[PDB]
């Protein structure tokens, strides 16, 4: 089995764009910064 959905508790700050939460603000400041700018392969002639 697999332990879950025990106890509350978001912290206050989490990152909206992927399931991931964090505890000190530094620390998703930074995060925040990676879901920009560098895209994953697309054109083939760009
Ligand atoms: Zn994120």
Same mark, same amino acid.
């Given at each position: 089995g697999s332990? $879950?959905?025990s $106890?509350?508790?978001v912290k206050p700050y989490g990152?909206?764009?992927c399931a991931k939460t964090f505890?000190?603000?530094s620390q998703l400041?930074?995060?925040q910064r990676?879901?920009?700018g560098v895209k994953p392969s697309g054109?083939?002639?760009g």
């Amino acid at each position: 089995g697999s332990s $879950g959905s025990s $106890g509350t508790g978001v912290k206050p700050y989490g990152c909206s764009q992927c399931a991931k939460t964090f505890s000190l603000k530094s620390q998703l400041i930074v995060h925040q910064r990676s879901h920009t700018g560098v895209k994953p392969s697309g054109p083939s002639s760009g």
